Nucleic acid binder design. Structure first.
Ligand SMILES: Nc1ncnc2c1ncn2[C@@H]1O[C@H](COP(=O)(O)OP(=O)(O)OP(=O)(O)O)[C@@H](O)[C@H]1O
Ligand SMILES: [Mg+2]
Ligand SMILES: [Mg+2]
Lengths: 441, 437
RNA sequence: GGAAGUAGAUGGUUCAAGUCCAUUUACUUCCACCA
RNA sequence: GGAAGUAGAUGGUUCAAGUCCAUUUACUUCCACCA
C-alpha cells in the first residue's frame, strides 16, 4: 500500500523473466557469430546492450560502423546487404535512415549502418550519436536498470512512451538520462511534478535551468534536445500523472488500459445528449510508414478544424485513426446547422466611390447602415459542417498533406450517425468527447 | 422634369393652403385675447411665428416669460395654471420640462413656461434659449421660409424629421439654421453630400469646418450642438439620400414611403429562406412618455443583443416596436440551436493548485489537456436563443431600463413563427431583414 | 514526410489584402524512422 | 428617463476573472419632452 510495496509489485510487470533473458542471450550469441564470420565492424547498443529493456519487448540493436568517407548511398547498400545476410527473416521499411529489421532465433533485431565518427559533432547520418549514447551510459547506468524499467513501464502504461510521431512521447534513451540525473524512478517522478514548459535538464552539467522550451541536453551533443519530439501536451500529461501518483500511489499506474467495446446505442445516446455534430472524413490509407503518415493526419485534421472554426461551426476537438486500409479524420462541432444568411462589412458612409462599388452587386436583401458603416446580407453555400467539409476537402485536398491529400483527391466520404459508430473509431470518439468509463484495466 | 421643376411640384406638398393659414390666425387671435386678459408676459415663438411649418402640420408655440426669481416649482404651477385656463382642451404629459398641450378653435397649441433672462448662457430652465432662437431667425428667415418647408418635407418623408428619441433626426430649428447657412434647400442638399461625421457648421461665423463630431453650433449658444441628438446613422442616411437625389431627382423623395403590407405567410417564407431564428420579447408597454420609453427600448434591445453575442447565437440585427398595449424586442440570430456541450478554459498545467480545483468540479465528461492547458466540457442550461433570452430577461430584468425592466419583471413572453407574424411588427421585421418589393 | 526560419513570386476572396484562403521559387535548420 | 465622465462600495460567475455578468453611494456634465 505504501510506494515501496507498489514499486516492488510494479517490478514484476517490467523486469524480463529468465526465459526471455535466455532467448535474448542465445540470439545475441548467434548474431555475434554471423557478424564475426563476415569480418565486419559492429557494436551492440540500445536497451538490450544495457539491460534496460521492458519485459515482453526484447529487441536487439546492432550498429555497423562504416568509414566516415562513405556516401549515403554506400551506407544504404552495405548496411542493407549485411542486415539481410545476418537475419533469419527480414523487413525493410524506413522513412529516411536505412536499416534492416528482422529476426534471429525468434528475437527481433534492428541492424543499423552508421558512420564511425571520432566525435558526435556535425553528425553525418541521423543515427551517429547512438554508439556515443551507449558509451556514455554504460558505466553510469549500472545498478539502476530496474529504475529505468519502472519509468519506461509507467510511461508505456500511460501511452506516452516513445518519441516516434505516432506517440510524441519519451524515448528509452530519455528515460535512461532521467534516471542518471535523478537517481531513481521515485526521484524522477517527485521532481517532474515541478517541471514547466521552460525546464532545461542538462545531465552532463548536473544542472536544471530555465530556457525557451523543455530541453533535455544530450550529454553527447549539447545542441541536441533528447526531448525534441515530446509534445507540450504529453509533457503536461506526465507532470499531472507524477502529481497524481505521489498523491495516491497505486499499481494501477503501471497497468495499461484498453478501450471497451461500446455499442452504437450508447454512442447514439451520448451524441444526442451532447447535441453536437459528430462526423468523419474517411479515405484510403496511403501505403507509407507511420512516421510519414501521422504528421500528415495531424496536418489534414488541423486544416479542416481551422476551416470549421472560421466558418463559425465551433468545432470542439478533432481526432484521427489509421486502420489497415482506411484513415478517418474525426470532428465534433457545436453548430449542426447555421443560417444561410450572414453579414458582410461594407465601407464607411463618407467614402462615396467605395459605397457605390459595395451597393452595385445585386443581392436578395437590401444593404443597410449600422454605426456609420454599410453592411450587406449575403448567403452561404453550405449550412452544415459536413457540407462545409465536403466543399473544403474537395477543393483544398492539396493542403492536407502530400500523401493524405493525394488520397483525399482520389476518394473521400463524410460519415456520421450509426454509419460512423460502426467504423473502427469508437475509442477515438470516446477520448475526443471525454466519455467516462470507456476504458478498462 | 429636371431639378428645379421637381422642387416646384414639391411645394404643393409642403406649403399650407390659405384656409389652414387662416385657421391658425384666428386661433392666434383667440390666444392673444385670452392671454391679454390675465396680463401675462408671453411671446409667440417657433415655426408658426416664423411662418415655416409644413402643410397639415400646424402647431402654435406660446412662451410664458417669468422673472428669474421664480422657483423651479412656481414656474411649473403658475405656468401650468395659465396654460389650462387659456386652452379649450388640454393634456399635461412631459418628460422633464413642464408645459401644456391643447386645442384652441381646432388648432394644436403648446403653452410653455420659461425664465426671461438676459443672455441664453448659463441656462436656468431647459427651454430658455427658444425665445432667443426666434429673435435670431426673425428677419434672416424671411424670403427663405419655403426653402425651410422643402427641407422639412424632405426629412419628414424619409423618417428623419425630429430631434426626439423616437426619431433622433433633425429638429425644425436646425432645418432653419441650415437654410440660413446655405441659402436654399438645393444648396443644403448639394453640400450635405460632402458632410462627414466630423463636420462642424458654425452659422454665427458662416463657415463649415472639421472638428471632433457632427456639431451644428447654436448662434445664440456656442456651447450647444443643435444636432446633439442626430444619430450618426441618420446623418449617414441623409448624406446618402442627398447623393441619391442629386444623382437622380424625384418627387418620390417628398412622399412618405408606402406602408407595403406583408402577410404572415410571405414573411414566414423569407425567414425560412434566411434560415435564421427570428423571435420577439413581448411585454406590456410602460405608461410613460415616448422620450422616456424609446431610450429604454434601445437599452433593453442592446443588453439582450449583447447576451446573444456572448452566448454564441450570432445575432444579426435587432429592432423594437411600441404598440398601444405592448412593446416588442425583435431579434434575428444565425443559430437556431446550439449544442448542449461546450468548452470552458482552465489553468495552465504547471499551476498544481488551480488544476486540482479545476478538476475537483463535478461534470458530465472528462476534462482534457490542449496546448499546455486544461479544458472542461461543460453543459448548457439552454440550447436555443429563445430559451437563452427567456433566462436572461427573467434574471436581468433590472438592467433593461427602469420601466421597461419593471414591466418585463412582472410578465413577458418569447414569441416566434406564425404567432409573431400576427403581431404588428411586420414593418420592423422587413426593415431588420432588408426585405425588398 | 512534417515543422520552424529567411528572401522573394503569384492566384482567389473583398468596396478595400503585408493583413483572410491558397499556390509557388531559393537558401537555412530541426524532428520522426536507430538510440 | 437615457447617455458621457470624476472618486469609490459591493455581489455573482469562474481554477482564477481590478479584465466576465451585474448591483450601489456621492459629485459632474449632456440629451429628449418647447425650440
Ligand atoms: N481587402 C480586405 N478584405 C477583407 N478584409 C480586410 C481587407 N483588408 C484588411 N482587412 C482586414 O484587416 C486585417 C488586416 O490588418 P490591418 O493592419 O489592415 O488592420 P485593418 O484591417 O485596417 O483594421 P481596422 O480596419 O479595424 O483598423 C485582415 O485580417 C482583415 O480582417
Ligand atoms: Mg530495442
Ligand atoms: Mg410647433
Amino acid at each position: 500500500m505504501k510506494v515501496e510495496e507498489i514499486l516492488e509489485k510494479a517490478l514484476e510487470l517490467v523486469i524480463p523473466d529468465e526465459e526471455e533473458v535466455r532467448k535474448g542471450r542465445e540470439a545475441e550469441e548467434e548474431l555475434r557469430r554471423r557478424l564475426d564470420e563476415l569480418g565486419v565492424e559492429y557494436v551492440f547498443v540500445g536497451s538490450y546492450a544495457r539491460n534496460t529493456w521492458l519485459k515482453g519487448s526484447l529487441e536487439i540493436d546492432v550498429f555497423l560502423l562504416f568509414p566516415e568517407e562513405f556516401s549515403k548511398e554506400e551506407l544504404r547498400e552495405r548496411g542493407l546487404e549485411i542486415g539481410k545476410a545476418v537475419l533469419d527473416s527480414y523487413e525493410i521499411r524506413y522513412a529516411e535512415h536505412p536499416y534492416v529489421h528482422g529476426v534471429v532465433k525468434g528475437v527481433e533485431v534492428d541492424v543499423v549502418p552508421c558512420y564511425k565518427l571520432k566525435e558526435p559533432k556535425n553528425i553525418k547520418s541521423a543515427v551517429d550519436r547512438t554508439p556515443f549514447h551507449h558509451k556514455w551510459l554504460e558505466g553510469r547506468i549500472k545498478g539502476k536498470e530496474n529504475e529505468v524499467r519502472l519509468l519506461k513501464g509507467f510511461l508505456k502504461a500511460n501511452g506516452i512512451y516513445g518519441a516516434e510521431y505516432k506517440v510524441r512521447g519519451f524515448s528509452g534513451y530519455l528515460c535512461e538520462l532521467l534516471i542518471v540525473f535523478y537517481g531513481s524512478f521515485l526521484e524522477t517522478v517527485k521532481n517532474a511534478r515541478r517541471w514547466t514548459r521552460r525546464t532545461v535538464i542538462d545531465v552532463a552539467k548536473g544542472e536544471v535551468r530555465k530556457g525557451e522550451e523543455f530541453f533535455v541536453v544530450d550529454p553527447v551533443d549539447e545542441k541536441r534536445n533528447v526531448a525534441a519530439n515530446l509534445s507540450l501536451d504529453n509533457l503536461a500529461r506526465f507532470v499531472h500523472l507524477c502529481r497524481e501518483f505521489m498523491e495516491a500511489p497505486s499499481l494501477g499506474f503501471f497497468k495499461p488500459k484498453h478501450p471497451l467495446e461500446i455499442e452504437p446505442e450508447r454512442l447514439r445516446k451520448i451524441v444526442e445528449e451532447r447535441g453536437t455534430a459528430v462526423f468523419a472524413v474517411k479515405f484510403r490509407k496511403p501505403d507509407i510508414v507511420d512516421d510519414n503518415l501521422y504528421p500528415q493526419l495531424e496536418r489534414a485534421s488541423r486544416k479542416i478544424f481551422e476551416f470549421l472554426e472560421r466558418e463559425n461551426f465551433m468545432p470542439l476537438r478533432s481526432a484521427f485513426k489509421a486502420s489497415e486500409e482506411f484513415c478517418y479524420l474525426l470532428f465534433e462541432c457545436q453548430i449542426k446547422e447555421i443560417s444561410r444568411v450572414f453579414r458582410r462589412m461594407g465601407p464607411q458612409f463618407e467614402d462615396e466611390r467605395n459605397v457605390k462599388k459595395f451597393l452595385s452587386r445585386n443581392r436578395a436583401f437590401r444593404p443597410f447602415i449600422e454605426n456609420g458603416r454599410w453592411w450587406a446580407f449575403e448567403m452561404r453555400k453550405f449550412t452544415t459542417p459536413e457540407e462545409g467539409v465536403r466543399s473544403y476537402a474537395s477543393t483544398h485536398w492539396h493542403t492536407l498533406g502530400k500523401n493524405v491529400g493525394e488520397s483525399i483527391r482520389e476518394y473521400f466520404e463524410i460519415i456520421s450517425g450509426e454509419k460512423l459508430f460502426k467504423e473502427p473509431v469508437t475509442a477515438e470518439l470516446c477520448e475526443m468527447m471525454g466519455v467516462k468509463d470507456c476504458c478498462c484495466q
